[PDB]
Ligand binder design. Structure first.
Ligand SMILES: *[C@H]1O[C@H](CO)[C@@H](O)[C@H](O)[C@H]1NC(C)=O
Ligand SMILES: *[C@H]1O[C@H](CO)[C@@H](O)[C@H](O)[C@H]1NC(C)=O
Ligand SMILES: *[C@H]1O[C@H](CO)[C@@H](O)[C@H](O)[C@H]1NC(C)=O
Length: 390
């Protein structure tokens, strides 16, 4: 079993391949790009059929260490990787089924360059700032295109409520780590995600940027539930009193806590179908090694429950006049000003709390189709659409 110590780049890489070697049939290690200094942003994928998207099977992801000195997310992801493989081998059906019905992508470190700087300071005592930024001195969580300005306007005066476009030269305005992550987001239809931070203990959800103050999304109720699921499954987050901060239910709207623009969280929601929340897991950004095991044991149940949350709401296929799959179709839910689209295979996913909704689907060159559906508290309900040409 992996030791509860801090793993630097080389050990992190060895760990991922070690897990892959132990569970060859359900894992795949791949890089989404290189850091400023040449380090690979390695991702470990779990699935009973790795390397391929299966229709109606949602894709989810965990991202940690975007801030070099926030190492807990990094270690929790390495421990989680070993845990998933072990439990699969133990034949724990909760985990086996999770892996069989979901495609899980784990990125332990989005800022490997910064981590090395943080780890060398002390060592392992970077304090509040050392290694936070990437090699070019840029804060990656202030490096993503700001799409909030557009959505706030569109919510007020009307207009597109999803997949806002990036600036023409975005590839030259972002850091290599950021660019790698954005291309990654463009490569898979991620449905649910969590970015792991350090510095506080609370489940942070959209929107991060203040409208001017609490700044909710059209999916506020859902996001609160998603945040609460992690908070209440977590060992002490739900307490609300951590690091001298008080957060009722251990959750918080980002903007309400403090305004933040150009962050990765809101980018996910406004540029893709992925609903992401930010999990602050510890007052100490770089905890001592003797605390890693307690943190792991206090987080694992929540880490599993959060991923299981992707299996709720509705999902289905959007078909054209010949009954062939229709990619990029738009699915909208009455009362919720935020749509989602079908992926390349024609399948779409829509997280929703229990209730009765009026759902509609459409696509360029086709006429809308509306249906009324009932969403239960358990598994998702299959809702397909057959569109006719305009
Ligand atoms: C589905 O039923 C609801 C009422 O429960 C209705 O408002 C909605 O228009 C129906 N959908 C269609 C396509 O008629
Ligand atoms: C979905 O099921 C609920 C009962 O659970 C029912 O009230 C609702 O009308 C159903 N939706 C449609 C379109 O029939
Ligand atoms: C999908 O499941 C829901 C209950 O979760 C049910 O109300 C709905 O009718 C089901 N879809 C179909 C096509 O039966």
């Amino acid at each position: 079993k992996l030791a509860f110590r801090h793993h630097r780049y080389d050990d992190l890489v060895r760990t991922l391949y070690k897990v892959q070697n132990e569970c060859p049939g359900i894992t795949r290690v791949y890089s989404i790009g290189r850091s400023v200094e040449g380090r690979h942003l390695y991702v470990l994928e779990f699935s009973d059929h790795p390397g391929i998207h299966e229709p109606l099977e949602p894709e989810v992801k965990y991202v940690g260490n975007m801030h070099g000195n926030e190492a807990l997310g990094r270690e929790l992801m390495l421990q989680l990787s070993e845990f998933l493989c072990e439990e699969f081998r133990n034949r724990n059906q909760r985990i086996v089924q999770l892996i069989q019905d979901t495609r899980i992508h784990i990125l332990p470190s989005m800022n490997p360059d910064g981590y090395e700087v943080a780890a060398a300071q002390g060592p392992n005592k970077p304090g509040y700032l050392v290694g936070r930024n990437n090699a070019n001195g840029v804060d990656l969580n202030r490096n993503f295109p700001d799409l909030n300005t557009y959505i706030y306007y569109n919510e007020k005066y009307g207009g597109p409520n999803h997949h806002l476009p990036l600036p023409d030269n975005w590839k030259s305005q972002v850091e290599p780590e950021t660019r790698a992550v954005i291309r990654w987001m463009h490569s898979f239809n991620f449905v649910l995600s969590a970015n792991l931070h350090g510095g506080a203990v609370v489940a942070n959800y959209p929107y991060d940027k203040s409208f001017e103050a609490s700044t909710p999304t059209p999916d506020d109720k859902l996001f609160q539930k998603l945040a609460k699921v992690y908070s209440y499954a977590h060992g002490w987050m739900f307490q609300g009193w951590n690091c001298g901060d008080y957060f009722p239910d251990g959750i918080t709207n980002g903007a309400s806590w403090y305004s933040l623009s150009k962050g990765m969280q809101d980018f996910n929601y406004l540029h893709t179908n992925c609903f992401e929340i930010t999990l602050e897991l510890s007052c100490d950004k770089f905890p001592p090694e003797e605390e890693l095991q307690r943190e792991w044991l206090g987080n694992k149940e929540a880490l599993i429950q959060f991923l299981e949350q992707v299996h709720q709401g509705i999902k289905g296929m959007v078909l054209d006049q010949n009954y062939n799959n229709l990619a990029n179709a738009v699915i909208s839910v009455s009362g919720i000003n935020h749509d989602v689209t079908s992926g390349d295979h024609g399948d779409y996913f829509r997280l929703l709390l229990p209730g009765i909704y009026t759902v509609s689907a459409t696509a360029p060159g086709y006429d809308p189709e509306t249906v009324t559906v009932t969403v239960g508290p358990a598994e998702p309900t299959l809702v397909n659409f057959h569109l006719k040409r305009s």
